[PDB]
Each structure stands twice: as C-alpha cells, then as structure tokens.
Design a binder for this molecule. Structure first.
Ligand code: GTP
Ligand code: MG
Ligand code: MG
Ligand code: MG
Ligand code: MG
Lengths: 14, 46, 104, 350, 51, 360, 49, 286, 49
RNA sequence: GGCCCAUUCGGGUCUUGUAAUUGGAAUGAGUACAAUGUAAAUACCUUAACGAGGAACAAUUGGAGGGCAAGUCUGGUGCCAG
C-alpha cells in the first residue's frame, strides 16, 4: 500500500 | 488476510462518505433555510 | 427582494460542493457555492443538471436567478433559493443544447 | 553561522542579566459603495505601491528587480537553434515567443475534462493520436478517456461520449489547472478534406506524475452440475491454485443471482464449488467482476511546423483507421458481441 | 477465407471513395448545414407543428 | 544542469527551496574532511520525509555519502507517520514542513514520533505560538500542531500531529513598515515525569525579570503526568511577547538539563526574550527566515517587511544568497525615515508562485 | 542535423506505436476473458483485485 | 427597478491588469480569413490611411502609430496553415475576421472563432468583402442580414460587422477604411488571464549571428546563434539570462542574452511629454 | 422529461446466448429469473399450507 | 380495435388505424429578361423564362409521461427498495 502510488524513491547507493 | 483488510477499508470509507454528505446537507438546510425563512417574513411584513 | 431589489444577481463561483457525491444527478451534486459581487455574501445555487455542472468552473462569473419550486420533491434540498442562468455571459441552456461555446 | 541551528546566538546569561536589570531601553515597545469597488481599491492600492517603490530605485536597480517591462523593444539572443529554422525561414509565418512558468517545464500526466466538439463528425477513441495546444505549445499525445463510475474509480472508456464531457488523461508538459485547450486530429493540408478540424475541447483539472486508470476484466465460467443453491462451475479457472486465490469472491449470473466461490474441486483442475442465493440453470453464465490496471503511453511529438520546408504538411502518428486501411486489415470483430433481435416464447410452468 | 477478406476490404474502399466524392473540386470549403443553422440538440418534433 | 551548493550548511532550506521552485540542485562536499564523512542519520531521515510528501522526486546519494542530487517532484502530502531519530527532535522535521504544507495537493496530516525538545531545534511551543502565527498572517488560516505525548531527551517517546487544513494558491503580500507594540507576555512552562514544583519555580524566575514591565505576564503551567509524559524526565519554559494589534509574536525558549536550577532557567529565558525584543523590528531573528521565504514565493508584487540592524547577521546574509541562487530574487533594503531607530525596510518582489498541485 | 536526428528517433517511435494499435490486445485488456482465452496460470502472477 | 439591474451589469470578477502604466506595447491586430478574401489589400489600405505611405509588399508584422497613445501591429495569418492559425489566436488583441460576402462563412473562419473562444476570446471585428459581386440589392440586403446574425452567435450580440464593396487600385474605398480605422480607435481591450500571466513577444525581425567561417569549417548542419527583436507584452520578462522560453513551431530555448533598445516606432504622446489632432509627422511605420 | 436529452434515453440492446452454449437454450435475464422465482414461491406457499 | 366517464368495481359508444403503397394537378418564396419610374438613380407598380415529394425550398418554444443493459452507486429482514 506504500508502493502503490509512488514513482520516485530515494536511491541510496552507499 | 487481504479480504479482511479490503472489507474493513471499504466499510470505513463508506461511513466517512455518509457522514460527509449528511453534514453538507444539514449545514445548507440550517443556514440557508434560516435566510430563506427570514426573508419570507420580511416579505410578509411588507 | 432576495437580491436587494434586483431580479438577478452576478456572482463568483467558489466551489462545487456536491462534486464528491456518488449518486449522479443528485440534489447535492447540482449545488455550487457563489459569492455575490454586489455585497460579497456567499450563497448556494442550483445548476440545472450535472451535465451543466461541467460548464461551471471555479472563479467564473455567473448570473443567478430565483429558484421556484411549485411543490415539494423527495430529494430537494430546501434552502437553496437560486439557480445559475448564465455563466461568463452565456446561457447555460444554450451551452447545454450545444448552441454556443463558453468564451474564456 | 548556520540556519540548521534554529535558536539564535545569545550572549552569556550574566551579561544579559546585568544588561536587562533595567528595562528602560525596551519600555518604548510596551467606505466604498459596492463590494466590487472594495476589491478594485485593493488591486489599485497594490499597483500604486509598486510604482512608488520602483520610482525610488535607480533605473539599473529597477531593471534588475522588475525586469524588462512590457512595451520595451528588446533584442533576445538564442543559441543552439536548429539550422532548419534559419534556412526554412518564411517572413509570412509568424514567430511567437512565450515565457514558461516552472510548471510548464515539467513533464507528466495531465488530467483534464474533455469533450468531442459538437461540430466534429466523429467521436474520439482511446490511445488515438490527438494534436493538443496547451499554453504556448502544440504537440501530439495519446489520451485515455475515463469515467468515475459514480465517483468510485477511474475506469477506462473506449470512446468519447457523443454529447458530453469525459475525463481524459494524457502525458505531456504540465500546465496550471483550469487551463483550457483545444485538440485537432489533422494539421496537414493534404488531409484536410471538407470537414471541421477542431476535434476536442477541454480544460485541465489536475497535474500529477502518475495515474491509476483501470479497466473492467470479467472472468467467465459456466455451470456443469447444479444442486439447488450449490453449483459446480467450470472454465472460470485453469488450475485449483487459481481458484484458491479467489475463494470468497463475489460472483453473479447473467440473471443477476448472486453467489460466492466456496472451494476448489480436486478433480478436474480449475473447477470449483459455489453457493448462490437461488437455484441457477445450465443456460446461465457466471461472471466475476475484476479490475485490471491500464497505463498511459508516454508519447511526445511536438509540432515543429516552422522547421519544415512546407510548414503546412506536418504529419505525425496516424489514426487507427488510417493504419488499418494502409495495411489492408479488416476492422476487428467478434461474432458473439454482435446484437440480434430476441424473440421470447411465452413462459409456462408445470 | 481470403475471398471474404477481399470483399470486406473492397467494400470499405468503395465507401471511403464515395465519401471523397462529396469533397468539392473547388478549393473553397463551405460550412455544412449543421454549422450554418446551428440548431444544436433539440427533441424530435412533429410536422403538424410546422403549420 | 544542477544548481550546485557546498557543505551541509542550510541543508533543509536548500531542499525546501528546490521543492518550491522545482529546480534540481546538487549539494556536494558534505563534511568531506571529517572522520565520519557525508550525511548524518537525521539528514537521511529528513530526505525520506521529503519523499513521503512529494511524488516523482529523485534523490540520489553518492557512494561515499558526500554528495546529494535532488530533482524535485510535486508536493502532494496526505496522511503519514515519521519516526524521528534520537539525534534530532520532532521540531527539526516539523519546521521545514511548514514551508511546504500550504502548497500541497492533499492536506498534510503527519504524525511525528521521537524526542519533542532540544537545546538547538525548534520546540513544540515555538512552532505553535511562534511560527504558526506568522503563517496565519500570510494566509494559512487553518494550521495546528497537536501534542499527543511529550518526550524529553534522551529517551524521548513523544508524539505530535501536524495538521495544515488550509491549502492556498500562494502567500498574501506582506505590508508591515512599523514596529509592533507589545501588549502582553504569555508562555508555557512544562514538565514531564517530575514534581509539579519545578514548573512553578521556573515561572517565579521569569516573573522576577519581567515584573518591571508595564504589561501583563501570564505564564501557563502545563505539567505533564501519566502515560503521556514520555520516557525521560524534563522541563522547560517558553515565553512569547504578543502584539494583539496585528497578531505578531516574539518568543524565546529553552529546556532544563540535569542539575540545573529551575529558577535560573526562567530568569535566562525571560532575559533572552528581552534581548530578542531589542534585536527585533517586525519579526524575531528565529521567525525571520520563514517570513522572507513566504514573501519570495508570493504574488508578483512588492511586499514590505521592516527589519532591525541586529537581525542582519551571517544567517540573514547566507539565507539571501541561497534564495538568489535558486529563485534569482534579490532583497532590496532601504533605510526608514525615522531617527529614533535605525531599522530598514526589506522589499522583495514575489516570483508569481502558484499552488499547481491542487486540483480545481 | 540535430533536428533530423530527433525526427529519426520519432519516426522509430511512431512505427512501434502503429504496430501496437494494429496488434491484438492482451488477454487482460479484452473484456470477458475465459480460461481458454488467456494463458494458463496467469492470474497467479497478475494479482488482481 | 432598472437602476438595480443596470448597476448589476457594472459588476464583474475583480482582476489585475498587468498592462504598463506608461509606454504600453502596440496592440497585435491579426487579419484572419480564408485565402483570397482580401487580407493583403486590407492591410495596405489601413496602413496608407494611418501612415500616408503605401507598402507595395507586406510581410510579417507591421507596426504603425494609429493614435496619440495607441500603436497597432498588423499580422497576416496564413490562410492555409492551421498551426499558424492557432498561435496567433493565443496573442492577438484584435482580430479582423474577413468573410467573403458572396461565398459566405467558410470552415477556416469558423475554426478560428472556436480556437479563439477556448484560448481566451479577443476583440473580434467582422469585415465582409466581395459585396460588389452581388448583382441585386434585394439579395445583397438579405445576405448581409443573414451574415450578421450568424456572426452574432459566435461573437456577442451587437458585434460590429463591416461591409466593403470593391477594390480600386488594390485599395478599399477611402471613407470605408476611415470608418474601420475609427472603430479600431474607440475599442477598449480587456485583460485575458493567460496573456496577463506570461511574457510574450511577436518577433519583428530575425537575424542569424553565426560566424560565417564556422558554417564552413563544420558545415551548414551546425547549430546557429540567432537574435530576435520585438516588443514585449504581458508580464515583465526577467533581466537575467537563462530564462526558459518556447518559440511556437521550434521548441524550448534559454535566453542567452537580452538588452533593451530605443523604441523604433515611438508614440508621440511620449515625445511631446518630454484636444490636439495627430501631427502628420508623428504618424510612423516600422 | 425535463433537462434530459433524447440521447440519454437511448435503448440499450439485449445480448444473447453464446453459440458454444446454444444447445442449452435461451440465456435468461433478470425478467426471466423473476418468472421462475415467483412461480416457485407460489407453489411452495400452498404446499406449506 | 379506437375513443369517453369513473377514488372503487366497472360502465358507455361505433368506421376506425397504418410507424403501408400510389396519382396527377396548383403556386409562393427564390433564380430573374424588360419597360415604367426619376435631374440621374434607388424604391414602387406592371411584366417574359425557370422555379416542389424528404415538396432537404429541412419555423421554433415549452410541458407531461414512458421503456431498455451480461452497466454503475446506495440501504436492507435471500430473489427487494431507492
Ligand atoms: N471584387 C472584389 N475583389 C476583391 C475584394 N477584396 C479582394 N478582392 C480581390 O481578391 C484578390 C486577392 O486579394 P488579396 O489581397 O491578395 O487577398 P489575400 O487575403 O491576401 O489572399 P492570400 O494572401 O493569397 O492568401 C485580389 O485580386 C483582390 O482584387 C472585393 O471586395 N471585391
Ligand atoms: Mg495576402
Ligand atoms: Mg439568431
Ligand atoms: Mg404524394
Ligand atoms: Mg420560418
């Protein structure tokens, strides 16, 4: 339900 | 498990909608009806 | 007189209150909140039907006229005394019948 | 030193305490006729302040703050302009320059209220190219027409309503809501014909980066063994694993008799047991209503008429009907979906 | 099967050509009857009301 | 390409300004030379908070963590819960959201969990009585910060609910060219998991300093007791000087540490309030950044805000330079015609920002 | 030229979309699907509502 | 109760007009009509009356001083292009809608009105031509009445529709053009929401600033640096470079450089400032 | 009929039994089902008496 | 079979209906040759030829009732009600 309506996202490559 | 969540979500959404629709109707009837009855009395006074 | 002596009143469309109502062509769906330009008082008006609700949008100039109910209806919302007769200077019925296009 | 520390710097407590033993330093601190005229007073009052403040500043300071005011004759230099513009330059065709607000730069899904033009002969189809004119820009997109279903969901429509508005979602440069637009299917003179070319008219209602259009997907099955309320259904599913996912789901017949998927049958695969509010018949068809997501195609083809030599023969993605004619393909058709006259024999019972 | 397909496509091509025949040879495009009178959406009326 | 910045300085503001302007930015060389380079945990937590209220935003953190790329999306909002790491209080996260909430598609209803106070970040009462009133002046009619549970350091355990019901096109243009008159002094002296006597002792100390004034002093005693008192003992005082003529407020706040005298803290905070009033012309130094940003994102008109010479410090200058880098907007300062004081008028032209995320 | 390069890319994009309009719809897009109409075991992966 | 009703018609939605208080830009007058209806002959005739100089060849915008404080820019819409029809409809303050009286309304004439109504209706004047082709006064009168009444449906009732009989020496009758120039002068232009929120300009001249050797060492395919001149309209344009801007039919570009130049066609109410009719010297064309 | 177009009051046609199922008989609709249920309840009512 | 009255049950009366096919006549708006008219001209009056079946040579405005789907939403005491 958190993933349903999202398009961005923090891409943490550390 | 998914069935339980969907039913509870749907029931909650329906209850909120019915409360919201009642409020907008009741507030309009009370506030606008007061103005309507007020104006009609002035017309009778005239 | 409801408009302070005038037969019609100019107004500004603020919001469409019943937009979220689920039942189509409901009494609530046809209600729009309007601010009278003459005195700034906020009032509620009826649109003839939901088809006409499309033409009305926020911040549009609208001419209001009294709404007369010959007899009680099951679903009517008493208190609403006005109906929208023109939007941006064009008759709603003319728009509803596709005889004119709303100028912006 | 830095704004992350919300509290501001203060001197040492005893120094402030001596400083503020005596508070004398800070003791100093302790009709228009019509509502329309009232508003017009407010705008004019604000406009007057702008002029007074601008008059105060120097001309260079003015130009730095307000910018180049309208009425100014200016020279604007551009770089990285296509060579076709300089070569295929016709003074008859105007060059219109338009400033863009921050929203105009962004690309995303535009949700709008749209209708077929009353004088346009034909209705529009979903995923059918349409040249739109939003703001200063013209481009070709693939819009999806949708309905609310009594304000419950965004369901995909096949065509525009004949004589009313419908919601439309398409991908392109974002614009402020309440921005009107108009749509055209063809712009080249070669294809103009004699009909009206303005295809659609609409108004932008919302901007977003994603949309959740969904389409009605019905699963169809048939009974094969009926016992009063209970019945065994076949062809709905392929394996007993699929049935397990849908146990407890609502189902109904064409007659409108409501039921439920109770349990999957071990033999044969895909069959299942259901209970209905009333006895069903062998001629009935059971349907399960389900919803499947639909995705907007991200197609962007700006109309660069000026760059072309002709400037009146710009052509983009073609309509589905045109594509079928070019490839000599028949319009898809389903014999079952066709409507026929239905004659009913008088109903009698024993 | 191929014979039927040719018949369907052939029927469509003829109809499209028939539509093209309506297009006037002269360059000028004249408004059709719908745009001219602008009667909009009206109910169906009986001819007795005409007189 | 990306507008580049250097260092961790003004991290929240730069992220907030980029979100409002929609211009992608790069922040590089974040604590490059430290033994522990790159972002802190609360900074990564803050970025996660930004994503929860926006859609379509792209945030990339370098492999070493010393560089951040931010491509903002549209402000959306909605209902959510955010767990604040113990390194920072809730106020460190509630504060930036005040810049974004009134310009959202959906209403902001965020539940913040964690420590509710610290020596360096905004307190609950600072936001409620010190910053939210400023927003109300700019047109944010309905904004509230409900305190459900107080959590003092180090164990915290508090819960606060930010609700901003008002969604507006843009802030109203400010016009204040006068020095507000203070009518009364109010405040909140609070305590958690300790005896009530501490709160009454802080009020006594503050009243000692403020009694010389000619205006009323009414400090409330909000003693928190029971399940809603968090997990650690704590106490603090916040004093707000109010000007009911135009609804302006000047405030100072601090919390008590282990071994500190409650009377001394009340004396200090009340003594700091007078210092803040001395340094202020229209808004406090702590309320100044919020006002300036709102004027920048207002309508394309010349707003006027009076400021003192004491408010023009390093923090004021760096704020203006960051704004210009993002918005290209220049703050023009002119002297006031008076000789009793040395104030200046900060005049900013709005950029014509409009809330385009909201459906119409 | 840069404009010509963009046109070549768009012409590629247009060619793909023209085929998709012609091509038969996916089983999910078709209304009233049946077990024979669709692939076997599809609904396990689809995650319908 | 007319007094109450009359006062109501004065009321409108309050709006902010961004037009400068001093030295406003010329109004953009778009001459729109089907091919061959007389766009070029009308522009030449109007310019000769307004300037007393006859332009044998007209191309692109033409700026003239039609009044002591009013300036007008004439732009001829290519009748064969719908893309051009769209982008003039987004900027034109006044539209001179040409109608062939003999033929009647055409598709292009009706297409432009619908585009105009949806993007913000400007001031519209109908100008009927080819009336000399009529042979009978009885049928001429009927056609004029029918044409006017249909025009009143698209544009507010009582909208002015002019009549032009014939062309002499590529010019319309001198008095009739005088009346047309008169009604343009008495026009009052109301603000449009889109035009008052964005900056825009119609390019008066186009120049390529690319160094010729660069065209040779790399070839014609190389991208070009160009300079575009014209009057600014709408909201002020920011002075700093880097401002994003869209050129219709070309794409989105960033302003590399910008500078203000002395007005080529200054209005003479400004100069005299530095009941009296316009001096002949004051009327200018650019 | 006030404020309703004739297009709104358009007839929606009735669909028919699938050919693969033509042997079973006529596809019952709601009206057909009502005839069954009413008849059954009339008989069951008398039998209970 | 149509129509009339009647809250109720029912009662009164007779050439009616077509959402069928078909025939030849008439003429006005229009398209318009002339003369007359007038300082000249417009207009008026008079007057050759052509001018109808979707007579598409395509008047409106308002009101009262319906009926339909493998459609949608809401509330329930199955199959109902809105
Ligand atoms: N008889 C008559 N001819 C006219 C009239 N107005 C224009 N014309 C003629 O129409 C022809 C075209 O005139 P233009 O001025 O070129 O018209 P346009 O709009 O510029 O046409 P394009 O530029 O080619 O698109 C010329 O031969 C004119 O003499 C009129 O009122 N009567
Ligand atoms: Mg020409
Ligand atoms: Mg008319
Ligand atoms: Mg006959
Ligand atoms: Mg008639």
């Amino acid at each position: 339900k958190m993933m349903k309506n999202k398009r961005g996202g923090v891409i943490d490559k550390r | 498990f998914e069935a339980r969540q969907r039913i509870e979500e749907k029931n909650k959404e329906s209850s909120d909608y019915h409360a919201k629709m009642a409020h907008i109707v009741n507030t309009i009837n009370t506030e606008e009806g007061a103005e309507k009855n007020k104006y009609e009395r002035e017309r009778k006074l005239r | 007189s409801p408009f302070g002596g005038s037969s019609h009143a100019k107004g500004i469309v603020l919001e469409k209150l019943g937009i979220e109502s689920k039942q189509p062509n409901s009494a609530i769906r046809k209600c729009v909140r309007v601010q009278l330009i003459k005195n700034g008082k906020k009032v509620t008006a009826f649109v003839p039907n939901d088809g006409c609700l499309n033409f009305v949008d926020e911040n549009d100039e609208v001419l209001l006229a009294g709404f007369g109910r010959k007899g009680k209806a099951k679903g009517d919302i008493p208190g609403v005394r006005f109906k929208v007769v023109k939007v941006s200077g064009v008759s709603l019925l003319a728009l509803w019948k596709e005889k004119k296009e709303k100028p912006r | 030193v830095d704004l992350e520390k919300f509290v501001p710097y203060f001197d040492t407590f005893e120094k402030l305490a001596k400083k503020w033993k005596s508070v004398d330093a800070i003791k100093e601190r302790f009709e228009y006729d019509t509502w329309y005229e009232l508003q017009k007073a407010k705008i004019s009052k604000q406009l007057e302040i702008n002029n007074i403040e601008y008059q105060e500043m120097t001309p260079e300071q003015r130009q730095r703050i307000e910018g180049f005011k309208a009425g100014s004759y200016v020279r604007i230099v551009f770089e990285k302009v296509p060579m076709e513009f300089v070569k295929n330059f016709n003074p008859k065709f105007p060059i219109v320059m338009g400033g863009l607000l921050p929203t105009e730069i962004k690309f995303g899904i535009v949700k709008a209220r749209l209708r077929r033009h009353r004088w346009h002969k034909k209705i529009l189809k979903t995923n059918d190219p349409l040249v739109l004119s939003l703001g200063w820009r013209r481009f070709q997109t693939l819009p999806i027409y949708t309905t609310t279903d009594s304000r419950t969901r965004t369901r995909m429509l096949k065509y525009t309503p004949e004589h009313t508005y419908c919601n439309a979602a398409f991908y392109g440069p974002l614009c402020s809501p309440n921005t009107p637009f108009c749509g055209v299917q063809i712009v080249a003179n070669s294809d103009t014909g004699n009909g009206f070319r303005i295809a659609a008219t609409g108004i932008v209602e919302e901007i977003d980066v994603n949309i959740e259009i969904v389409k009605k997907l019905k699963l169809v099955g048939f009974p094969y063994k009926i016992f009063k309320n209970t019945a065994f259904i076949k062809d709905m599913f392929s394996s007993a694993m699929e049935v397990a996912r849908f146990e407890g789901a609502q189902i109904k017949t064409v007659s409108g008799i409501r039921g439920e998927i109770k349990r999957a049958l071990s033999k044969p695969e895909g069959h299942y047991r259901a209970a209905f509010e009333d006895k069903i018949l062998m001629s009935d068809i059971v349907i399960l209503r389900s919803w499947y997501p639909v995705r907007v195609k991200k197609f962007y083809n700006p109309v660069t008429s000026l760059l072309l030599k002709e400037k009146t023969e710009w052509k983009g993605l073609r309509l589905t009907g045109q594509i079928r004619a070019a490839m000599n393909l028949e319009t898809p058709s389903n014999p079952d979906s066709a409507y026929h006259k239905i004659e009913r024999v008088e109903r009698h019972f024993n | 099967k191929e014979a039927h397909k040719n018949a369907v496509i052939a029927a469509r091509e003829g109809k499209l050509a028939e539509l093209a025949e309506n297009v006037s040879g002269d360059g000028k495009r004249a408004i059709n009857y719908q745009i001219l009178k602008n009667k909009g959406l009206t109910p169906k009326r009986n001819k007795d009301n005409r007189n | 390409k990306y507008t580049t910045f250097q260092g961790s300085q003004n991290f929240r503001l730069r992220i907030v300004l980029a979100t409002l302007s929609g211009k992608p930015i790069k922040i590089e060389k974040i604590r490059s030379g430290d033994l522990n380079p790159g972002l802190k945990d609360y900074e990564v937590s803050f970025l996660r908070l930004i994503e929860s209220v926006t859609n379509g935003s792209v945030i990339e953190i370098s492999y070493t963590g010393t560089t951040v790329i931010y491509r903002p999306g549209i402000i959306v909002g909605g209902a959510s819960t955010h767990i604040c790491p113990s390194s920072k209080p809730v106020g460190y996260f509630v504060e930036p959201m005040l810049y974004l909430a009134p310009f959202s598609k959906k209403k902001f209803s965020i539940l913040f969990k964690g420590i509710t106070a610290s020596h360096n970040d905004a307190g609950i009462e600072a936001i409620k009585w010190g910053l939210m009133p400023v927003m109300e002046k700019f047109g944010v009619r309905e904004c509230a910060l409900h305190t459900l549970k107080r959590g003092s350091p180090p164990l915290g355990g508090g819960e606060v609910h930010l609700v901003v019901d008002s969604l507006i096109a843009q802030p109203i243009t400010m016009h204040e060219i006068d020095r507000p008159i203070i009518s009364s002094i109010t405040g909140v002296a609070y305590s958690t998991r300790v005896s009530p006597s501490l709160v009454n002792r802080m009020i006594d100390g503050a009243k000692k300093v403020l009694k010389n004034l000619q205006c009323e002093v009414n400090i409330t005693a909000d003693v928190w007791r029971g399940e809603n008192s968090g997990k650690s003992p704590g106490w603090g005082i916040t004093l707000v000087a109010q000007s009911k003529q135009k609804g302006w407020s000047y405030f100072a706040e601090d919390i008590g540490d282990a071994g500190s005298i409650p009377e001394e803290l009340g004396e200090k905070v009340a003594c700091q309030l007078l210092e803040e009033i001395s340094k202020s012309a229209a808004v406090g130094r702590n309320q100044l950044p919020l006002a300036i940003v709102y004027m920048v994102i207002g309508k394309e008109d010349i707003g006027r805000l009076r400021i003192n010479k004491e408010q023009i410090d390093e923090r004021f200058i760096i704020l203006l330079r960051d704004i210009k880098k993002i918005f290209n907007t220049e703050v023009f300062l002119k002297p006031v015609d008076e000789a009793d004081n040395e104030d200046m008028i900060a005049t900013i032209k709005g950029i014509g920002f409009t809330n385009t995320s909201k459906k119409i | 030229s840069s404009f010509e390069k963009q046109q070549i890319e768009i012409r590629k994009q247009i060619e793909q979309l023209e085929n998709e309009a012609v091509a038969e719809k996916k089983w999910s897009l078709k209304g009233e699907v049946k077990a024979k109409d669709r692939p076997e075991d599809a609904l396990l992966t689809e995650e319908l509502e | 109760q007319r007094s109450s009703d009359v006062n109501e018609r004065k009321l409108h939605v309050p709006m902010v007009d961004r037009t400068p208080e001093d030295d406003p830009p010329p109004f953009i007058v778009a001459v729109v009509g089907p091919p061959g209806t007389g766009k070029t002959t009308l522009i030449r005739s109007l310019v000769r009356r307004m300037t007393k100089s006859t332009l044998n060849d007209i191309q692109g915008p033409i700026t003239v001083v039609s009044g002591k404080h009013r300036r007008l820019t004439f732009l001829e819409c290519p009748a064969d292009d719908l893309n051009a029809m769209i982008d003039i409809a987004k900027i034109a303050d006044l539209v001179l809608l040409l109608i062939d009286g003999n033929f009647g309304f055409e598709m292009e004439t009706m297409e432009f009105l619908n585009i105009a109504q949806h993007h913000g209706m400007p001031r519209v004047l109908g100008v009927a031509t080819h009336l000399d082709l009529f042979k009978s006064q009885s049928t001429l009168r009927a056609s004029k009445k029918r044409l006017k009444h249909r025009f009143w449906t698209e544009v507010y009732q009582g909208a002015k529709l002019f009549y032009l009989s014939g062309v002499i020496n590529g010019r319309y009758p001198d008095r009739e053009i005088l009346n047309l120039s008169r009604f343009i002068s008495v026009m009052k232009f109301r603000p449009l929401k889109w035009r008052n929120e964005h900056p825009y300009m119609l390019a008066d001249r186009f120049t390529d600033l690319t160094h010729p050797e660069l065209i040779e060492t790399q070839g014609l395919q190389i991208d070009r640096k160009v300079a575009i001149y014209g009057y600014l309209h709408g909201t002020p344009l920011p002075s700093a470079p880097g401002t994003r801007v869209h050129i219709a039919g070309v794409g989105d570009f960033s302003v590399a450089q910008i500078e203000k130049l002395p007005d080529p066609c200054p209005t003479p109410f400004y100069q005299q400032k530095l009941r009296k009719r316009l001096d002949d010297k004051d009327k200018l064309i650019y | 009929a006030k404020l309703v177009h004739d297009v709104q009051k358009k007839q929606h046609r009735e669909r028919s039994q699938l050919t693969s199922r033509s042997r079973y008989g006529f596809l019952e609709k709601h009206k057909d089902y009502v005839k069954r249920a009413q008849d059954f309840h009339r008989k069951q009512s008398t039998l209970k008496v």
